[PDB]
Design a protein around this ligand. Structure first.
Ligand SMILES: [Zn+2]
Lengths: 68, 58, 121, 104, 36, 174, 150, 60, 242
RNA sequence: GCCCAUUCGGGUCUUGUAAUUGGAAUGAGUACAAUGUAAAUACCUUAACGAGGAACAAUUGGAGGGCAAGUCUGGUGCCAGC
């Protein structure tokens, strides 16, 4: 706070989900969006790295642990 | 069964207590990091003022 | 070699018991033998005084073994009735103690008395 | 010293410099063109708090003072040496915290 | 400690009193309610 | 007059913790009280330094040092045994401001805290013998240390009870 | 596994250091004696004029070895620092290095004040908390962080 | 149009008291200050003794 | 807390000889040499071992013993190992010497000296019970009149209450302590100098030690248990001091 | 749950929030009266009043945040800045 008022930095409450669509409720704001989207990006990236290893499987691998 | 229920209760209290203590310590570690960032930025600009005040005697 | 060896003479007696009366008016004194040994084995004791003419002498001679073990000075005084008049109480108290307190305005006189009686012993 | 010997100089505002700056409370928004009277010249003063920029409009007989930055800021412009401390008799700090009232 | 209270281990010693059981039941129930 | 003086730097960490400890320990109001007591301590031991740096057996050093130690034992900050001049050089601000009336009536008892001591002796209750003192910063002399008691015209002594007590006695006897 | 974190020495406040009672113990060192001479101030009377209190100076065996080691230009300094008014410590460590001898000696006691003049020693001393340094200046001394300079 | 100021900030004697008794309780976390000693009977050290920790300043 | 009847585990500590007694609140505990009898009224753990045998342990009350506070504050190493010989300057009564005795064990000995008389008869009446200690009722300022009965101790310890602390420990350590041997002293600031304060008197005493050829290596303050004492641990070098 | 130290470490209910709440003491004032004074004010006294948000309302600065179905600028989506 340098040169502002407390009424200049009052609180903004957030509006609810409409009762007209209350069956599939809980309107989903920006913080919940970014917490969804970064999770989806991480899942897609790990799916694409295992897909890349599958496309380069190298079909002649062998260890002692593959007997049973 | 009394002892097993008691030990399960003690463990499920203690791991959650230590969990939120850890996340609180991490939360305040973030503000300590931001405070050190402001301090190093101010110190770096002060020293880059001083190192040319040391050369303006030329 | 009697059983009450560090017996104080007259002028040291008068200064230790006017320090006694100042402590009694400053609420810093414990009166009596068993409260003296209770505060002694609690630890809060600047120094303790006994009277060398109680009719059994051993009922306060049990205090040397506590006090010179827990490293606190102790002094005999030749009159239980004078020590009672010093403590400011009707019956003659025979064993007084001064508690330790760094929020008391007789710290200088207490330390002067304690240095004098450590030189005496 | 920065204007003869005085520490403060009365001045006449020409126009609010940068009303069309879109970013609110910015350096190019918080400037005015003051005509210094003591030698009759132009200068660019730096009124704090754009929310209290709009007290001063036009020839409001404003009273300037130096600025003296105590560090380095993010997007502050250099060149402005003068801040507004009093406008038309009253002090605009007291005006912005709305104790007094600007007289006209 | 009383002879009818000296249990065989500190687990049964901790079960033997009341305030610890009160705190454990309310804290554990609040933890299950917070997890659900 | 100008008793108090600003120190050689007022914005410093060790000085800030000094004023914090002294203020919260002896129950003080602002930095001006520590600065007044510190100033007059500095003045009297700056005067003591010159009497030390000149030679012994000078009449100036002899009876002016006797004057200074008589004044300091009269205030009470110097014990009865160290009656020579360099203990005045070894004086300290703590046992110099300890003799103010606030700390002194707390040490005497009768107040149960330093802050309660200050608020009652500014609520006009403590009188040194005969004179009601309503100011803390007194520096009570050594001779009148045992004349501190509640004043007789005050309801912690033996006067009429206060207005709160008698108003509550009225509207609790109704 | 023994870690060792030294406790903050319990005669210290946050940074007030109430252990420095007015009869002081100072730690003289080498270029402070040299600068005291080439500013022509005294030692004991100079410290008394700066601190208004009786100061007992100390020099260590490491600093005396440094003053002997610095050759014959500072025979005035060595004749001055063999003063019977001062006392003398006795160090036991390897390597006569006045800087780490001084800063070790003071950071394990927190009761000495350090009378130094060189830049690195002043930096380490004012880096570690709550011990006052003094130094020469103009024609007198100057204290850096004593809580009662006056 | 002022910030909400403080009842502690009103009287300077109070603010220089509630700053001290906080800083009195602050340095129960940098040292271990003397707090009277053995008050009751010895109920153990009551808060944890660890083996691998030496809080002793050593002589270089 | 820690009432009589709880079950407490007995874990070993770094300093061999002592043990941590971890219950719901912790204790410091030494393994008792003569079982069945407390010496100054402390509580005793009592474990059973398998012919069924039963061995007991004593707690170590740090508010009434000196070096227990140093142990709990955490010293880097003592020299009171389970085999050494330990001299005890200023053995007041059984209240600490019994703890140093049963730390030392059945092989090593503890020579406990004492100047006063009534603590002397209490020390002897305790000393008849366990055999690994030697009570001496002589002044610690004269180590040439009990030179007849002791020899070549392996660590000295000091609690005497006299302002010639350094001279006492220097004379007793020159007369008895072996080379490269330990010396653990416990200075009381208000005892040995009332005028100047704690850190100054500690630095003066440790300077007197390193003049008397004890190279010190540890200083601890033991502040939460006693006020303004200090534990100073040192070696006795005598050869290659630096 | 608190607090401290470039980080992992250290230490502590003997730590914070609650009108849960109780009575005691007051002078700012207000005021008979007397006092002072050329007369009068002020102070010094003082009966009767005079406190809980003790609202009988202490300020001046400074450092940080955080919040929207909001606004604006830039771009290598979901971002960065003001
Ligand atoms: Zn050295």
């Amino acid at each position: 706070a340098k040169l502002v008022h407390d009424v200049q930095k009052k609180q903004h409450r957030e509006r609810s989900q409409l009762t007209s669509r209350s069956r599939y409720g809980f309107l989903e704001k920006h913080k919940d969006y970014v917490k969804r989207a970064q999770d989806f990006h991480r899942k897609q990236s790990t799916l694409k790295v295992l897909r890349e290893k599958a496309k380069e499987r190298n079909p002649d691998e062998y260890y002692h642990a593959m007997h049973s | 069964k009394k002892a097993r229920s008691f030990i399960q209760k003690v463990l499920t209290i203690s791991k959650a207590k230590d969990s939120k203590r850890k996340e609180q310590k991490a939360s305040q570690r973030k503000e300590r990091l931001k405070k050190l960032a402001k301090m190093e930025e101010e110190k770096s600009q002060r020293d880059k003022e001083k190192k040319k005040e040391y050369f303006a005697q030329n | 070699n009697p059983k009450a060896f560090p017996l104080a003479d007259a002028a040291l007696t008068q200064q230790i018991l006017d320090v006694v009366q100042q402590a009694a008016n400053l609420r810093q004194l414990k009166k009596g033998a068993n409260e003296a040994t209770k505060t002694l084995n609690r630890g809060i004791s600047e120094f303790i005084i006994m009277a060398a003419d109680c009719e059994p002498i051993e009922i306060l001679l049990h205090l040397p073994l506590l006090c010179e073990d827990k490293n606190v000075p102790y002094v005999f005084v030749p009159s239980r009735v004078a020590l009672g008049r010093a403590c400011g109480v009707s019956r003659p108290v025979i064993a007084a103690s001064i508690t330790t307190n760094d929020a008391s305005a007789i710290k200088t006189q207490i330390y002067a008395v304690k240095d004098k009686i450590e030189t005496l012993l | 010293s920065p204007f003869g010997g005085s520490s403060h100089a009365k001045g006449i505002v020409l126009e609010k410099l940068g009303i069309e700056s879109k970013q609110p409370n910015s350096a190019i928004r918080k400037c005015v063109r003051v005509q210094l009277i003591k030698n009759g010249k132009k200068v660019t003063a730096f009124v704090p708090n754009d929310g209290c920029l709009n007290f001063v409009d036009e020839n409001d007989e404003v009273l300037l003072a130096g600025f003296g930055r105590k560090g380095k800021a993010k997007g502050d412009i250099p060149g402005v040496r003068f801040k507004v401390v009093k406008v038309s008799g009253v002090s605009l700090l007291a005006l912005w915290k709305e104790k007094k009232e600007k007289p006209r | 400690m009383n002879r009818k209270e000296r249990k065989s281990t500190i687990l049964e010693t901790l079960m033997g009193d009341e305030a610890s059981n009160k705190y454990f039941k309310r804290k554990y129930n609040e933890i299950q309610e917070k997890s659900t | 007059s100008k008793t108090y003086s600003t120190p050689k730097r007022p914005y410093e960490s060790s000085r800030l913790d000094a004023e914090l400890k002294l203020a919260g320990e002896f129950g003080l109001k602002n930095k001006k009280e520590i600065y007044r007591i510190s100033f007059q301590l500095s003045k009297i031991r700056r005067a003591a330094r010159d009497l030390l740096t000149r030679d012994e057996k000078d009449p100036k050093r002899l009876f002016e040092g006797n004057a200074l130690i008589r004044r300091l034992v009269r205030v009470g900050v110097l014990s009865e045994d160290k009656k020579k001049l360099d203990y005045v050089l070894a004086l300290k601000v703590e046992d110099f401001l300890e003799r103010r009336l606030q700390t002194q009536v707390y040490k005497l008892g009768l107040a149960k805290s330093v802050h309660h001591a200050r608020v009652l002796i500014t609520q006009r209750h403590i009188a040194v013998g005969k004179q009601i003192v309503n100011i803390p910063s007194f520096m009570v002399r050594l001779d009148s240390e045992k004349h501190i008691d509640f004043a007789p015209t005050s309801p912690f002594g033996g006067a009429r009870p206060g207005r709160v007590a008698r108003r509550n006695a009225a509207r609790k006897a109704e | 596994l023994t870690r060792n974190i030294p406790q903050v020495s319990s005669a210290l406040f946050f940074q007030y250091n109430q252990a420095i009672k007015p009869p002081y113990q100072v730690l003289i060192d080498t270029n402070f004696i040299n600068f005291s001479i080439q500013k022509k101030v005294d030692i004991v009377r100079g410290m008394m004029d700066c601190l208004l209190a009786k100061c007992n100076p100390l020099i260590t065996d490491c600093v005396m070895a440094e003053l002997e080691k610095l050759g014959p230009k500072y025979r005035i300094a060595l004749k001055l620092a063999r003063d019977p008014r001062i006392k003398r410590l006795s160090c036991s460590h390897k390597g006569t290095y006045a800087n780490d001898c001084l800063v070790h000696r003071v950071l394990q006691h927190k009761c000495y004040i350090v009378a130094t003049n060189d830049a690195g020693l002043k930096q380490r001393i004012r880096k570690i908390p709550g011990i006052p340094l003094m130094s020469v200046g103009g024609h007198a001394y100057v204290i850096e962080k004593l809580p009662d300079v006056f | 149009l002022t910030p909400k100021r403080n009842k502690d900030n009103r009287n300077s004697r109070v603010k220089k008291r509630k700053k001290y008794q906080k800083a009195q309780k602050k340095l129960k976390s940098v040292r271990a200050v003397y707090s009277g000693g053995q008050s009751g009977v010895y109920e153990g050290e009551k808060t944890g003794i660890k083996k691998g920790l030496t809080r002793s300043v050593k002589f270089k | 807390g820690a009432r009589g009847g709880a079950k407490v585990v007995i874990e070993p500590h770094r300093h061999a000889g002592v043990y941590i007694a971890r219950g719901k609140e912790d204790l410091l505990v030494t393994k008792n040499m003569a079982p069945g009898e407390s010496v100054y009224g402390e509580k005793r753990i009592s474990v059973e071992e398998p012919p069924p045998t039963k061995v007991e342990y004593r707690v170590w009350n740090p508010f009434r013993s000196k070096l227990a506070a140093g142990i709990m504050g955490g010293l880097d190493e003592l020299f009171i190992a389970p085999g050494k010989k330990v001299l005890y300057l200023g053995a007041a009564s059984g209240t600490s010497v019994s703890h140093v005795s049963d730390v030392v064990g059945p092989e090593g000995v503890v020579y406990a000296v004492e100047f006063s008389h009534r603590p002397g008869r209490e020390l002897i009446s305790m000393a008849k019970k366990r055999p690994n200690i030697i009570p001496i009722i002589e002044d610690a300022r004269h180590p040439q009149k009990y030179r007849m009965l002791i020899g070549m101790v392996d660590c000295v310890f000091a609690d005497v209450a006299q302002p010639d602390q350094a001279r006492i420990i220097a004379l007793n350590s020159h007369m008895f302590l072996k080379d490269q041997g330990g010396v653990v002293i416990s200075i009381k600031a208000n005892c040995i100098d009332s005028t100047v304060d704690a850190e100054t008197v500690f630095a003066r005493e440790v300077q007197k030690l390193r003049e008397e050829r004890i190279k010190p290596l540890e200083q601890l303050t033991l502040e939460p248990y006693e006020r303004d004492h200090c534990i100073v641990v040192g070696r006795y070098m005598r050869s290659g001091l630096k």
